[PDB]
Design a protein around this motif. Sequence first.
Motif, PDB file in Angstrom:
ATOM      1  N   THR A  95       0.840  -1.190   0.000  1.00  0.00           N
ATOM      2  CA  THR A  95       0.000   0.000   0.000  1.00  0.00           C
ATOM      3  C   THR A  95       0.877   1.243   0.000  1.00  0.00           C
ATOM      4  N   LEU A  96       0.624   2.140  -0.941  1.00  0.00           N
ATOM      5  CA  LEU A  96       1.388   3.365  -1.105  1.00  0.00           C
ATOM      6  C   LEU A  96       0.432   4.515  -1.368  1.00  0.00           C
ATOM      7  N   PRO A  97       0.848   5.747  -1.079  1.00  0.00           N
ATOM      8  CA  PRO A  97       0.082   6.904  -1.552  1.00  0.00           C
ATOM      9  C   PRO A  97       0.068   6.945  -3.072  1.00  0.00           C
ATOM     10  N   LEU A  98      -1.019   7.487  -3.625  1.00  0.00           N
ATOM     11  CA  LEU A  98      -1.184   7.508  -5.074  1.00  0.00           C
ATOM     12  C   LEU A  98      -0.114   8.335  -5.773  1.00  0.00           C
ATOM     13  N   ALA A  99       0.580   9.214  -5.047  1.00  0.00           N
ATOM     14  CA  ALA A  99       1.628  10.017  -5.665  1.00  0.00           C
ATOM     15  C   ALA A  99       2.869   9.191  -5.975  1.00  0.00           C
ATOM     16  N   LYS A 100       3.105   8.119  -5.224  1.00  0.00           N
ATOM     17  CA  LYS A 100       4.294   7.295  -5.395  1.00  0.00           C
ATOM     18  C   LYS A 100       4.061   6.080  -6.282  1.00  0.00           C
ATOM     19  N   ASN A 109      -8.526  -0.861  -3.815  1.00  0.00           N
ATOM     20  CA  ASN A 109      -8.772  -0.365  -2.461  1.00  0.00           C
ATOM     21  C   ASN A 109      -8.206   1.046  -2.284  1.00  0.00           C
ATOM     22  N   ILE A 110      -8.756   1.973  -3.064  1.00  0.00           N
ATOM     23  CA  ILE A 110      -8.305   3.360  -3.095  1.00  0.00           C
ATOM     24  C   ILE A 110      -9.169   4.181  -2.150  1.00  0.00           C
ATOM     25  N   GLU A 111      -8.528   4.981  -1.304  1.00  0.00           N
ATOM     26  CA  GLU A 111      -9.259   5.863  -0.407  1.00  0.00           C
ATOM     27  C   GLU A 111      -9.862   7.026  -1.184  1.00  0.00           C
ATOM     28  N   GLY A 112     -11.140   7.314  -0.926  1.00  0.00           N
ATOM     29  CA  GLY A 112     -11.756   8.486  -1.528  1.00  0.00           C
ATOM     30  C   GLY A 112     -11.108   9.778  -1.067  1.00  0.00           C
ATOM     31  N   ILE A 113     -10.851   9.889   0.231  1.00  0.00           N
ATOM     32  CA  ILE A 113     -10.044  10.974   0.786  1.00  0.00           C
ATOM     33  C   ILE A 113      -8.968  10.349   1.662  1.00  0.00           C
ATOM     34  N   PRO A 114      -7.835  11.028   1.833  1.00  0.00           N
ATOM     35  CA  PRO A 114      -6.730  10.439   2.608  1.00  0.00           C
ATOM     36  C   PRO A 114      -7.150  10.099   4.030  1.00  0.00           C
ATOM     37  N   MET A 153      -2.397  12.167  -1.830  1.00  0.00           N
ATOM     38  CA  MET A 153      -2.139  11.467  -0.580  1.00  0.00           C
ATOM     39  C   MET A 153      -3.074  10.289  -0.343  1.00  0.00           C
ATOM     40  N   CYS A 154      -4.034  10.048  -1.233  1.00  0.00           N
ATOM     41  CA  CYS A 154      -4.906   8.891  -1.090  1.00  0.00           C
ATOM     42  C   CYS A 154      -4.108   7.604  -1.262  1.00  0.00           C
ATOM     43  N   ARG A 155      -4.413   6.614  -0.431  1.00  0.00           N
ATOM     44  CA  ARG A 155      -3.680   5.358  -0.409  1.00  0.00           C
ATOM     45  C   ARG A 155      -4.372   4.310  -1.270  1.00  0.00           C
ATOM     46  N   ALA A 156      -3.565   3.443  -1.876  1.00  0.00           N
ATOM     47  CA  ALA A 156      -4.074   2.349  -2.689  1.00  0.00           C
ATOM     48  C   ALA A 156      -3.111   1.177  -2.593  1.00  0.00           C
TER      49      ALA A 156
END
Length: 237
Positions: A95-100, A109-114, A153-156
């Motif tokens: 699991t990583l932030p969407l920026a990385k 499993n993506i967060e709608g908000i961080p 910053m949303c995680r996936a």
Amino acid sequence: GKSLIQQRRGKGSPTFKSPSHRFRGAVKYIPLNYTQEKTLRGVVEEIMHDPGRTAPVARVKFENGIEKLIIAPEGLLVGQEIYIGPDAPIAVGNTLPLAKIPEGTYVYNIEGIPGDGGKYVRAGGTYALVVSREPDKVIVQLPSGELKAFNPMCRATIGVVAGGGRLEKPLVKAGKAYYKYKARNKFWPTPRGVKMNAVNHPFGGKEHHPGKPTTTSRRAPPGRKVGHIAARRTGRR
RNA sequence: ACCCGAAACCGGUCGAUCUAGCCCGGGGCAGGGUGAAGUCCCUCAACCGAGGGAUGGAGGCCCGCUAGGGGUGCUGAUGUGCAGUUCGCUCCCGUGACCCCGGGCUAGGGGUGAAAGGCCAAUCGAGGCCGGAGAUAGCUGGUUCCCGCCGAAUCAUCCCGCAGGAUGGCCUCCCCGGAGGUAGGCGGUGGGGUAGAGCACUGAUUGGAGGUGCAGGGGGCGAAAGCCCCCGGCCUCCUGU
RNA sequence: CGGCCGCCGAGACCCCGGCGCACGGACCGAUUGGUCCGUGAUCGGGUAGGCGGGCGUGCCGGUGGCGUAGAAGCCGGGCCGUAAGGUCCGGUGGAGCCGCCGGUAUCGCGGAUCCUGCCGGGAGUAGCAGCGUAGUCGGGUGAGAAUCCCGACCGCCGGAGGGGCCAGGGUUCCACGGCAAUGGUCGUCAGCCGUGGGUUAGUCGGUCCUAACCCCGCCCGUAACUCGGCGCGGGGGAAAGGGAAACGGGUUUAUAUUCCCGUACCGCGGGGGUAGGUGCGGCAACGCAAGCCCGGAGGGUGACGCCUCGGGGUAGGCGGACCGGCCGAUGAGGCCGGCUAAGCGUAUAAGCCCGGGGAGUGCCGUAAUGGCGAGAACCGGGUGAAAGCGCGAAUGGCCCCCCCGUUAGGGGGGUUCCGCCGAUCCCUGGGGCCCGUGAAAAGCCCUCCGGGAAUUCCGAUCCCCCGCGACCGUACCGAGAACCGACACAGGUGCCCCUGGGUGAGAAGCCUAAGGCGUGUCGGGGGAAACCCGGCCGAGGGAACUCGGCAAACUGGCCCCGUAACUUCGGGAGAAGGGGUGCCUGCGGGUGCGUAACCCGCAGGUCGCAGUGACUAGGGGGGCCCGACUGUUUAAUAAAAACACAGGUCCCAGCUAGCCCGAAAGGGUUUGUACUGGGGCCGACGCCUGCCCAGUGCCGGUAUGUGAAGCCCGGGUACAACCGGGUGAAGCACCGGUAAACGGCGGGGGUAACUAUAACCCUCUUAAGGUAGCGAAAUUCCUUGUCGGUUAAAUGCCGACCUGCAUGAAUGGCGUAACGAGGUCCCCGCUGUCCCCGGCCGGGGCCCGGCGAAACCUCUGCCUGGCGCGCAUGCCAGGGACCCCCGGUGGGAAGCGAAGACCCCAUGGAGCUUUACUGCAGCCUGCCGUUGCCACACGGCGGGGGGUGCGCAGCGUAGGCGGGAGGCGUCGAAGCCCGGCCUCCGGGUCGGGUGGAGCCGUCCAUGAGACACCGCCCACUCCCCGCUGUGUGGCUAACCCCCGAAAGGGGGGACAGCGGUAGGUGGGCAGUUUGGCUGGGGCGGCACGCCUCCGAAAAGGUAUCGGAGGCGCCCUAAGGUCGGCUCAGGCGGGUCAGGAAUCCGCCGUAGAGUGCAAGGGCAAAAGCCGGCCUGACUGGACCCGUAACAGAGGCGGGUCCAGCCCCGAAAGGGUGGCCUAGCGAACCCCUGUGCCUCCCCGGUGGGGGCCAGGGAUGACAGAAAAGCUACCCUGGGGAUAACAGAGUCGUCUCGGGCGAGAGCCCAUAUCGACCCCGAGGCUUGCUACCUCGCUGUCGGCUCUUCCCAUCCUGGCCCUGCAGCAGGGGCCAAGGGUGGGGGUGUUCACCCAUUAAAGGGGAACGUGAGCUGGGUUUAGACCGUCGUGAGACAGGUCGGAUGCUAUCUACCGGGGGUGUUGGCCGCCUGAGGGGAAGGUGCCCCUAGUACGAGAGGAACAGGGUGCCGCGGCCUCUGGUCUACCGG
RNA sequence: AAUAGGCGGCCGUCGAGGGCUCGGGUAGAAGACCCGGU
């Protein structure tokens, strides 16, 4: 007239309530304070079948001592180690932030908000495609085909949800359907409004035909939205 | 508001021991048959292959008075019943969407429904109990002693009026007022258009005679100007309606 | 028939006597009156109703009294009163009561399917049967015995009627004493009555844990709450889930895992030792007593689904030996007993491990799957269940024997082995399945971390001993009598848990052991019937029965051969079809150590009709429709073709989403996230799914129009109300997509005549004209379509054609294997369904002894023809009948079980639908508040300023009006040059400079003249300042959403949310409406408002869905007046000119015209032509009509007074049209006019009132307003339809009169036109007279009877009758008039016979006799119609038939009286009943009569069949639960 | 058979005749009917 099934479902009776006591539990990420600026390593202990999820679940024990339930990606191995955080390597189950997450990667499993815990791409066999990365937003193509913008910053989680191809095999039997729907307490079997009585359905009547066009307005009141609701078009194209 | 009777409407409450749905925890289904996947074996050949023999126990599979569940036909018995839905023979399912039990939840314009307007305690096209409430009806029924006097009506106008009302007509009781009144008849002064009758208007109606070329038609007849008849039309008279 | 005579006959009339009434009179009463006289030919019935008097009942104020020497009340009598009633006499009774006056009242009963209580007939009747038919003998008890007790015999259940035990019941449990009541009879008996008793726990259960779920506190919402709710904290929640610990023997009348004895275990605490603190054996798996106390963590266990198989074990069962006992014959043999709990000690199996070992051209193993260098064979070991074994424990239990036995007791023996089977009961491992994953916590064990005490000390999970262990339940049934259903209820709960032997696959059926019962409780009798229910059999035929093979019957288990179309290849399939089956003797085989047990074959012998001998135990096959299948449904008339289903496809939604609950707070989907959640439709599978977006929906856009509030501008108001305009969102208008969205997919002519007939073809026409398929279909009206097959016969079924009234492609089209208690047709077999019914068995029925009702009942109860509210037991005239009882069959009582299935009415309801009326939520949207900060753009405002003005003409680019012909010029000008500039590039404005002194008209043109000067503007635009909004971009600080106990962090963001207001949408949810007349109602029409003629009957009036027509206007002239003239038509004569243009003459009573229908009226006019006018006016009175007599809002009309006028010389006329149609309340509003008025007074704005005119209600004496009901409900109606009766007979059936004719002549042998007169009530219709507090329909079966208008049989007449036959008619009703195919059919059609195969009536005879196929509820499908709910005298599948006979009726069976005393026997026959008989064929007459021939009779004489009737069992057949055999 | 019959015999002005009871059917739902009874 009498109530509809949709109207009766909103009252929360045990006929319509989800049996959320035979399930393994909610699948949410660890709180964002642990994941932000720090990377945590966990070990997969067990992979189990959640009665109502359409996807296998896994138990992960982290080095800090937290035990969590996650949606198992395809190919996840029992006893393997996974990482969650900005510095996690790009591998399935991490699991990583969407920026990385590099473009062209498959995520779920993506967060709608961080920090919400994950809301998108959770069903079995589903994945989303990272399209573009920007300092202000990250674009992902969802299973429905829509391109959606998320906060960087949303995680996936990297990978594809296990359990794909489930619809390749027919259910065959009414008994099989009965067990499948009883597992999650979904209304089954289902009746037809045309064969209902006039007191029960807008389409009900002695003759088994709808007496009015089946496309209903978006502005219709409750107890009337049946058939094709606010349909842009109908038929086969 | 002389007395009794409605189906129904409304408020607040009571019910899932029947039955419907769903949740938690439990008990049960003699015996037999068929033989799916899977796992193979043997022989003759070997460029192909062909033949034979096993094992395996799957199924909303089959037979089944096991238990249990259901209720097709006899339209059988009973039908003031054993029973406010039972009994017998016959029949159907009988490892599954199966049958049953204890603990819970869903409550009335609401629940629940594999949808029959079915089920929600012998009650369901809107449950039950008490209250509004002695509800309302132009509709049905009833309305308790005797004698004496007088004694009707079902006809006109109006009403969402036509099984009901109102104004009149017809009945009865009491009072004022004080000299006329008229159901019958005779004579007189006026009015009428029915019966009958008739054709003088209006419209019908058989035949004949005379007159009229009369904007008619039919023929003969003539370059063309018009004739000769028949019939037709129009008047008068006779005749029959 | 024409007359007469005498009598008889009413409550009428006459007379005597009496009563009352009406009126008048006299006399007399301290509250309505009383006595008497006079008149009544001109008083005496009476419903609705009005009026007067009187009788009776309870109590109060007075007055006068009665009563224990007998009040009230009650029973039977006398008297009075017309009467309501009063009062006395005789009897009962034992304590109160009454007359009169005046008040007062829960004041007078035969009804209300009235209410409460009691009692009759039904009736000593039904019931005390059906699903388990059980008792008999001897004895005992007792007053009393079928029913109570003991023994024997005989029976029932025996995978439950036996054993155990929940819920529920609550003493029903035990003993003794009893039978007044209860018990379906009796009872000495009892779950009954009375009197005494009975439930004993550290170990069994509750108590503990948690599940689904529930409650309380805080918090939030609500006007509020006992109401709703998320989140936090707390608690509860299982007597079948988890969960410490006991098992034998004995004891009581009733309790025992609880009491006694024996042997144990668990928890807590204590005492004494010991292991350990400080100890060892194994390479290892591991073996071990292996330190104490407090706190924490981890692991394990608790702890789990379904299917299936192997291994181990135990209950239980079987065979044999041996010892006792019983039976048997003291033979063979059979039967009975031969028993062993917890606890303690003890170990292997599988599984999993631990060392050694080092394989493959591979070895090893299982029932099977399988395992191996990621370590196999193979050799050793560790851990690890149910069990077994030893103690417990033989002094106990069981069996047997002996002595004492008067009661009471005491002792002696044995209780041992082998083999086999074997669980559904325990343990243990494999394998397989899930789009299905099959609980939690308490508790317990182990390990590891920190902390504490311990050395002459600490100290156990090890050994011994001691003490303690609380509260509540404990009886009994546990069900064909202890529970629920009102019950000693054949139901349900609980069959919830368990099952010896034989046969057998079997927990099947049958028999039987144990155990239980004779209490699924009324008994006895019987050739003792008929009939009903349940069962067995039936000769010959074999569905001829019937809507339909309903019911019944055939087949049946096992083994071996054999097995079709089709197919989704799995199936169909046990297809179909064929053979065998017992017992005995002897061998062989499989597994096995076995001559233990189970199973499979072979040969021979033999018996019967039959060998799965009883029991158990499929009949089968071929087409078609529908639905793929398993499954579900209307509990209580429908199980299906209806629903569901897997599969297909469409729609919404990226999450603070979509859809939904709610008043809100909050919530369901959601511990969810597009392989998901929610919303339609089709419905497996195979091939396919065509055209149409004009309509109605939905979606997107919306330049433009409309569009509410708010805001802004002008007017108004000393301020507002009010008026006009601008801005103006959503929604409509408009445009585009969309049909697996609702739906739709037409219609005329002619052809290609190598006949006739088809589409190639040309004309209207829409959005387009139905494509592939299928088609007389569950869709087809004609229809029983036509053709072919099926039958002797076909309204059926199958195949085909297409003319598809009115098929068709996801409201899906076609096809389809398998499947089905679905509908449908056929074939083999089978049979009492039928020909045609006959026997037998058990239970009722019947009789006797007992208990002992109910439904129902105005009183009664014979018929024929009649009258009658139209179908009478009761009435009229006749006929007949002595009375009572038993058994039976149900014709009638329009029988009994109901305030009418159906239809109509009600300004009666409920459910449902919609583009019916009016409303409420939800949704869309503008404005105001929460709501702030930076800029940009745009649209309007105030303060200013700019350039920008070709109408036609022109020196020229005059926009408007004003003062105004001079104004400009060092207060610096023409003519030259470039620069910026707007611009119709016409051509104008302007900075600088060469330039150093001039520039325009005034004059004329121009529709309007000055770039002469001075002013205000108007048309576009820009910019400087300030105001105002609308939109756009950005920000955070309000607000919201997420994470977190919090701190705080992140995301959105002045949006959203919330509050207020404004418009739209809105059957999601409500309240309502949807009129009336009507030869029922509906559709239709309007007889629903007016006018004319007839009806209408010579005053007036008079109705019908009676007849014939008109009106809902028009006219400034078609209105007023005055003057003048005479019309239509016709004849004769005239230039074009004719039938008809214009003109002259004559006749011309109106034959014309009068605005419009009709009627009436009009000739010096009311018509036509002209002149002048507006009386179509204002303020009022009276009267007539609508609407007679006889009531009236509104309206119309007539006669007048006054004012102002018009025409005319004047008289005179004018208040619309010559008269009769052309129209309308309240409230509200608009207009005219001139007065009154508005709360202490006055002014203003505004309001109210009085008078006049107008806007309309046509349902027209004035609601605002759509439908279904077959899911229906209520109150009613024979005021009113369908069936049936009644009236009528148009119609129907059957006749008659005359005779044109047709028949070679001939009307009448036969047919008989055109006309005319009838009968019947057998077709249909018409009326609406009886019946809606119910008279149960069509058809069929069974049974009885009647008519004749006669089909056959008997007898005749005419003939265009040769015979055989035909045609027509007469008498005649004794008899007959049948069997089958399709169809629910009556009918009709068809088939084979026949003498003929007649028509009708009896409530369209007959449902308290049957059946239930059609019709006509509730379910469902197709076609058509409707937007829809839905509907169809359109098809189609399914869809309930209650009864104890009161009277009478008929069939049979008995007791009595009478018949002038009783009894026995034999007779007579008045009357009644019969069909006791009817009808074919054959031989002969006779190949004769007759006849050309063909053909072909009759009288008489013989024989025989069938139908009908009455008897019988010798023959034959059936049965034969006597009997005999297998 | 309401004109409710005829004849033979036995009996009365104690008594002819009959019924119940008894053994059985030429009969039978109860009644009734028929044979036998020293």
